Design a protein around this ligand. Sequence first.
Ligand SMILES: NC(=O)c1ccc[n+]([C@@H]2O[C@H](COP(=O)([O-])OP(=O)(O)OC[C@H]3O[C@@H](n4cnc5c(N)ncnc54)[C@H](O)[C@@H]3O)[C@@H](O)[C@H]2O)c1
Ligand SMILES: NC(=O)c1ccc[n+]([C@@H]2O[C@H](COP(=O)([O-])OP(=O)(O)OC[C@H]3O[C@@H](n4cnc5c(N)ncnc54)[C@H](O)[C@@H]3O)[C@@H](O)[C@H]2O)c1
Ligand SMILES: NC(=O)c1ccc[n+]([C@@H]2O[C@H](COP(=O)([O-])OP(=O)(O)OC[C@H]3O[C@@H](n4cnc5c(N)ncnc54)[C@H](O)[C@@H]3O)[C@@H](O)[C@H]2O)c1
Ligand SMILES: NC(=O)c1ccc[n+]([C@@H]2O[C@H](COP(=O)([O-])OP(=O)(O)OC[C@H]3O[C@@H](n4cnc5c(N)ncnc54)[C@H](O)[C@@H]3O)[C@@H](O)[C@H]2O)c1
Ligand SMILES: Nc1ncnc2[nH]cnc12
Ligand SMILES: Nc1ncnc2[nH]cnc12
Ligand SMILES: Nc1ncnc2[nH]cnc12
Ligand SMILES: [Zn+2]
Lengths: 461, 460, 460, 460
Amino acid sequence: GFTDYKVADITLAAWGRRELIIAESEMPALMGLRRKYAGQQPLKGAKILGCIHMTIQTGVLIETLVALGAEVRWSSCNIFSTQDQAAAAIAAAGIPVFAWKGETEEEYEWCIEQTILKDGQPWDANMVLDDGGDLTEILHKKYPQMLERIHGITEETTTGVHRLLDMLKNGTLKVPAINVNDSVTKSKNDNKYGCRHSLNDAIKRGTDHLLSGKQALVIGYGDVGKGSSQSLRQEGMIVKVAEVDPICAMQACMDGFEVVSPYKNGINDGTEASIDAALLGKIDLIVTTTGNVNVCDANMLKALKKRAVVCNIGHFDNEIDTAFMRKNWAWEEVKPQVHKIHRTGKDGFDAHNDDYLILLAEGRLVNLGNATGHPSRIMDGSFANQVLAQIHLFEQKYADLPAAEKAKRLSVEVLPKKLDEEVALEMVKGFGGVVTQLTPKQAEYIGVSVEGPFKPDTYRY
Amino acid sequence: FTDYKVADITLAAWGRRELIIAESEMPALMGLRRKYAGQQPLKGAKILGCIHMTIQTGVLIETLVALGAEVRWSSCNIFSTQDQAAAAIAAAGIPVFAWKGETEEEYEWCIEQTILKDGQPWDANMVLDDGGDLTEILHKKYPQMLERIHGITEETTTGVHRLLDMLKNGTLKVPAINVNDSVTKSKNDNKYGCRHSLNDAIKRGTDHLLSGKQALVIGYGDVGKGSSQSLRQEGMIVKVAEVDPICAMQACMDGFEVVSPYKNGINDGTEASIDAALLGKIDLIVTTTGNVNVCDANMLKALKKRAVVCNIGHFDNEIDTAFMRKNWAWEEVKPQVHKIHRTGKDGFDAHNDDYLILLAEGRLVNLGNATGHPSRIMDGSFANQVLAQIHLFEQKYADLPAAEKAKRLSVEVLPKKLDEEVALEMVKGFGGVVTQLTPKQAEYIGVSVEGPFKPDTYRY
Amino acid sequence: FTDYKVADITLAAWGRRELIIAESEMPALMGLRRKYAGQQPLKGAKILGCIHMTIQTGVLIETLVALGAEVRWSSCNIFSTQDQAAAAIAAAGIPVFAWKGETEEEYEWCIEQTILKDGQPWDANMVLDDGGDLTEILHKKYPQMLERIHGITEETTTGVHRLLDMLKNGTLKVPAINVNDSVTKSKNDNKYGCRHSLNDAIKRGTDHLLSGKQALVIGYGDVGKGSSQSLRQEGMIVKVAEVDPICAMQACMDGFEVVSPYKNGINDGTEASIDAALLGKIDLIVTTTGNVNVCDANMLKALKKRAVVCNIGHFDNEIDTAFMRKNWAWEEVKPQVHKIHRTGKDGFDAHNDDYLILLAEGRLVNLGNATGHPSRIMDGSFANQVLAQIHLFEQKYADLPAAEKAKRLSVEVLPKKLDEEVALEMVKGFGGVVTQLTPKQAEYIGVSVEGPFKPDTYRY
Amino acid sequence: FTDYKVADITLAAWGRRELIIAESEMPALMGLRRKYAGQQPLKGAKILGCIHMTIQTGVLIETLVALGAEVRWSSCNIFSTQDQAAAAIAAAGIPVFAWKGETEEEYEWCIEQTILKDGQPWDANMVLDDGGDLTEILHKKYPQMLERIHGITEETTTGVHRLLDMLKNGTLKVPAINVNDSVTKSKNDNKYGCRHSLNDAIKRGTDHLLSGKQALVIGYGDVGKGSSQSLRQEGMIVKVAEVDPICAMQACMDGFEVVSPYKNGINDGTEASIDAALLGKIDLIVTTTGNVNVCDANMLKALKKRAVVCNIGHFDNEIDTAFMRKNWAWEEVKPQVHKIHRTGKDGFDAHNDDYLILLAEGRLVNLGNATGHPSRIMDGSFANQVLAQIHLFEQKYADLPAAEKAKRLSVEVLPKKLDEEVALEMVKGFGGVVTQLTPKQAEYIGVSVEGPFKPDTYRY
Ligand SMILES: NC(=O)c1ccc[n+]([C@@H]2O[C@H](COP(=O)([O-])OP(=O)(O)OC[C@H]3O[C@@H](n4cnc5c(N)ncnc54)[C@H](O)[C@@H]3O)[C@@H](O)[C@H]2O)c1
Ligand SMILES: NC(=O)c1ccc[n+]([C@@H]2O[C@H](COP(=O)([O-])OP(=O)(O)OC[C@H]3O[C@@H](n4cnc5c(N)ncnc54)[C@H](O)[C@@H]3O)[C@@H](O)[C@H]2O)c1
Ligand SMILES: NC(=O)c1ccc[n+]([C@@H]2O[C@H](COP(=O)([O-])OP(=O)(O)OC[C@H]3O[C@@H](n4cnc5c(N)ncnc54)[C@H](O)[C@@H]3O)[C@@H](O)[C@H]2O)c1
Ligand SMILES: NC(=O)c1ccc[n+]([C@@H]2O[C@H](COP(=O)([O-])OP(=O)(O)OC[C@H]3O[C@@H](n4cnc5c(N)ncnc54)[C@H](O)[C@@H]3O)[C@@H](O)[C@H]2O)c1
Ligand SMILES: Nc1ncnc2[nH]cnc12
Ligand SMILES: Nc1ncnc2[nH]cnc12
Ligand SMILES: Nc1ncnc2[nH]cnc12
Ligand SMILES: [Zn+2]
């Protein structure tokens, strides 16, 4: 009887299920939570609006939430990141999902709206799980009455957290949030090692280019930029790194990279004369990792070496000025999510023109657009933190609190270190790792309990 | 001038040549000399210093002096002094009591010579410490001196732990800056410094090939991360031990197998709990923890014949060297390199195969068997030290009214803005070029164009 | 009549777009097109080709044709064709019989379609082969055709071994060039190609994280060196098996532990000789040997649950997949990815935990589950192929008298000077700049300024 | 015993302690000592040896003696002797003339003391040489001695070139074994030895941070490959120069940018041909070529201020140090470390910023500023030397009639089977376990189960 979904092809469900069964075996933290909490049903009565890339890994997350008692309605947080077999397997399990690979922007917004509304009216949602803040923004702008009954938001990614903190600073945030991104088992696992795995993967799938011996420029050296620069350097690329943050730049130097700017002396005067044309004319690959806007700008695109590959692994596509390219240059599709952008003019191109760039995933997050994003064993950490964060906020029942008590709990918080450690331990056991137990004397010597937590909250890892 | 004690004053010219080179490798510190020369922000400061008397420390000392300070100096380890650096500092008219190869008694005597001048307490008003030994002696033996001291600037993880313990117990008498937890210290010195200097020290002491051999690194904090890289980049097969599952997760993701010396990780102190099969394959063990007895007697008994044993944490009690002194025979190979013969206490066969090689008698190996971290790394740590000395000296805690002392008695870190400023000088030293945000970009991410660029929660 | 057979001719435009990109990545091959355009050195050549029908092979084919040849083409593996490449070649009017996912019967039919044109032997006069299957079929079934063939140019290590065996037995009927042993082939394609494409294929088939997991690479020749790097650079903990102690020495020095699947390295053919403790910790096994049964049934039984098994040597008999077909149940995950359930032959539980994952049914994994080596690497191999075709075609062995044919049967390599010339074009493709020797320098080391730069004994 | 000259005989006990350690790191060489002690295959051999008088050479010498030889020894470089090794050898009753820091006159005198015993030619019958200086002196000055010599075993690439030049000109008087081109020498010592010892020597001489800095390695043969890895593994950004496009292709594929010091690679002797922008960014230049003047005066003028300059090829003429001696002022930092002030010849300002740092006066830096390659690597080279000495001594060329000498007068390598046997012992030293081929597998690949495993064409 179940029809409350919209996916590319329901017949892919059996394939998706085969891949979910494999992914379960690669996600011991998440599966450990399923086993530990199945009896208690800590999410019984939770009704979760979810908006995160509809991948196989998200499928295991969804089914864990459901196994713990929740009901959900789901969409993807990017137009190209859904794996159609994952979406189909979730729909076939009776779970509302509105997601397919290759959505238009209009369809993207419609999919989020289908999670929010059931049978033409607001669903009885009481929790939000978001990656990037688009669902959170729609709820605040269009559905404030729904937020009265929502207990919390659990936010996945750096960009989404920034958006929440902006709302909190402006006094416009209506429900408390957990910053899942800043668990160490998320930020220093997913953001870094996930991109290490999936950046080179996506570039190979899209282009099949040799990377060894070629020149790359990675814009940014935060967690994504660190993992991205390693993805490339481990393949034998000669990688240069750009940064605005001198501490991150110092790390890039010490890690063995030359630190450069696309602009002469680092100063963008807005003119083509401020571009380091000599530097850009030697770059074969540019990757944006910043979470910022226009860090690969029009003048940089004009100066790049002929046939350079351009991609973005930050959350939103506006890292690269693709609007400039759409307005001015001719796009030739090579295959899905791979375009040659011909710099010779807007109306048509010579099939044998040499003056083009190759753009991956139309500038949208390349790892998910041209490959399958991060691997299950990495997403295990992020998604175990999501489950714990959902349990915590659902149990706190913010929406049921009196006004004076809401005022004290309206915050953006992280999970306690003890839980971060518990996720990490399950990850380590998945690798067959064996953690040593402190003796009582050793635990006393460093001032911790034998079971942890092992570090002060100031610790950076 | 006679108010010093060093191994050999005639090494001064060599030390000075090396200081002049080190200046060229320390642009953050040299930038501070230029920036603050006019103000003389340390005029009237009288600084008790206790930190490894290396060439890099020499550049630190001379920066403090160039900013107006007077100092009295000792090393914080018996084997870490570079005798040419000590000589060059003494030859400049600066009181220094330090040499490579001190006894424990001589070590304590050197610290006491900084504290006392012409037989009585110096009129010290600032403390710069690495590991907390000087801080401990002042609190326990010279509490009256602390009434006139404005602050302590503490270099290293172990020393900071000790300060935070004092603050929690209410026994810390003056405010402190935790220099260790600047990012340009902890995530530069503690990690990349050990990356550079661990393999260096092992090569100088043993000249052993590392490629293809098996290592066990105990700990995966900043020092353990850098140490594991030092070995793996040489082609060692490195296994990592940890108690902290987050640090263990990082070791797995970084490409290491995570193992325990004890079966199932359970250290009951019995020989039966040792993973003898694992330890019997290890060619090199390195301790990085800041903890006690992490390479214990039963582990030492089980190690592969001819394994190398060393420690790069602050104190030698990471390894049970007392057990080895009590039970086994020590044959000096050359200074700071001993073969420890597991055949018994009273003599050894010159051709015995059942020995371990211990470096620096278990004391920090990078400084003991080589020269510690390189100048361009120590530039970051020591720029932070100078800024921290300026900050606490200018605050004049000792002279504050009682109500204001109560509010300022704390262990603090430097502001992120200054950490970034030190980083930028370091980056320029490499020829790196940082990009400047446009106004639109700065608005988009919610920061000022000049920084700071990250919230205080950020981990890098 | 369409004198081709491909999966889907509508993929031609896509293939053509990818050919145009690949041309830009293959400067040695495109340089040959330009250099030899005038001469048409392959005018009159009629080349039977059997090599993986990829985009890279497409550029090779079109270079041969641009130099005057006519060709008839098939793939040398059932899973290696890129259907868009085959379509683009068919659409250009070139006979090609190839698709991804051939049966063994279809594979042999495709080779036969190259050999026969319109129901009779084509008037072939040249052979280009990868692995020796076409060479074998010609000798076994069409020996009269070899009377008119001037030579064979053989791509890969396995094919060369087969040719040398024929030469030793007196069964080889035409001379050959060993293309594999150009340095710009063996030490480029076999090593760096596998470095690029092994981890690529494993990711596409499984999307498994590799970092922190345990791999066993069987063999450490050129393919094993590149394969081990592919995995270790992703953070795998890689162990290496070898029978050749020189290759094993290189693996140790490169930072790998060298192990055997068998106790003390001795296989007695029973499960008791398996190192079950070792195999029970392995997450991925990769065979690279060119040998037979190097991942045998007893090893397969002992592997860790849910281990990935794959082969990157030329033929699938490196792994005992016949044992698995006879005894265990195969569940297709997706094309070229099977779970092999060790619970029995007749069915499986969808939730069984005791399975292995086999890629490409044991056929070469880089081509089966991804797209093989990248264009910029295949540029070197395929430049050598073109040069080898030119050389043998020009020599005209088939036109020699019978007594002279007997004396001119050999297996030769290309001269070092040409290997250097290919390498120079590759380097220029990266933007590299080679220095020119001064006359004094060239005299000092005993070479010509233009090369060759090394004696024939040199191993690089 | 007085028939020696060393720096300080009292260092003998230290040398012996280090020899005993080195023995445990040299299982191939010690395996030969044990295997051949009974047979005494070198009984009656009288070996003139000229190779770096290190601890590793000490183990070599004592192995030759243990097998029956008598020797007379000198070093083949003025800065490479370890004085404790020389003392330990002299204290064992073995004639050795070597110390660290010889003058050129003393260097020649030391070689002459090996050649002459009590003022007259020794009754030498074998030569062991590293670089050809002893070989050249014998041919030019002592041709009568060569009549009674059975062979030369030559260690290094430069020496082999010199022998092959003599053979080509018809001036080589006795047969030679090219020890360099065993795989367990060239692809072990030349590459992995330099990987270990280059960064070691730079750190000992300068204590400079390498991570994040720019290096230029001139050459990408075995020494250049190992050198480039030594630097890149420490986090240097390494660029590579080459004249050989095949070696340059390998550098690109290995992840390096390939550059020339000269515009378009044309070294026309002019200042304007220097790529000033490139050289002005280089912090470290290392020469690895075996060629002459590859770091020339115009390059030295253009280098970044405070760049480090060193050579790891056999001879110091890779760098134009004569130009620097004639034009610039040298300030000794410490032994084997000079600042070269580009401000003029007559004195310098102690605070001048415009200088270069030269290590070991341009002589081989790994031996000059550190201890060269490690024992476990030199084990391979020196096991090959022992085998080569045995082979040529047993052949007794000097006793053959003139017509029979003609057939054996050649420069040859050891058989692959022996190369494999050395490698196996090396692998067992790491605890590696080689797999034994089954008879069916050996048949499949066409080899004997015991080896050799590869054709003579194989490049590894
Ligand atoms: N694709 C993925 O799977 C994935 C995974 C995790 C996070 N992300 C996204 O990637 C982005 C980066 O995340 P993060 O965790 O690395 O954030 P981060 O804050 O740790 O790092 C971003 C870095 O970009 C630098 N930067 C900003 N503007 C710059 C400019 N103009 N030039 C150069 N450098 C500049 C900043 O200084 C900072 O160090 C965010 O959008 C985040 O949501 C994507
Ligand atoms: N030698 C040097 O030049 C140098 C440089 C910087 C710091 N240090 C010293 O090195 C030590 C480590 O400093 P750090 O910054 O890395 O500290 P840290 O807190 O970052 O790391 C120490 C690690 O040891 C682990 N650990 C504790 N007990 C353990 C046990 N029994 N087994 C395994 N792991 C265990 C902890 O979990 C932690 O991750 C300190 O003593 C510090 O003062 C030395
Ligand atoms: N997939 C690809 O794209 C690709 C590329 C190049 C070559 N190849 C194929 O890969 C195979 C290997 O080629 P190669 O050039 O490396 O050959 P190689 O001769 O250089 O190396 C093969 C190695 O396998 C080792 N070996 C043999 N039997 C063994 C055993 N039982 N256990 C352990 N090690 C064993 C040998 O000692 C040898 O070192 C061949 O079949 C070749 O045709 C495939
Ligand atoms: N220091 C050590 O311990 C040590 C060890 C082994 C060998 N060596 C010596 O090192 C030298 C190199 O030995 P190798 O075995 O690497 O020789 P090799 O022939 O393998 O390599 C030398 C390389 O230098 C390149 N080259 C020549 N002239 C050049 C120039 N003008 N610019 C750039 N590149 C140029 C050549 O093309 C060649 O690839 C020899 O002198 C050898 O005796 C030293
Ligand atoms: N595989 C994945 N699933 C969900 N979110 C992701 N973010 C990055 N990779 C992802
Ligand atoms: N070189 C050095 N000088 C001072 N303190 C140090 N800590 C580590 N290395 C050091
Ligand atoms: N340690 C060493 N001893 C002898 N010859 C060498 N060549 C390189 N290193 C050496
Ligand atoms: Zn999102």
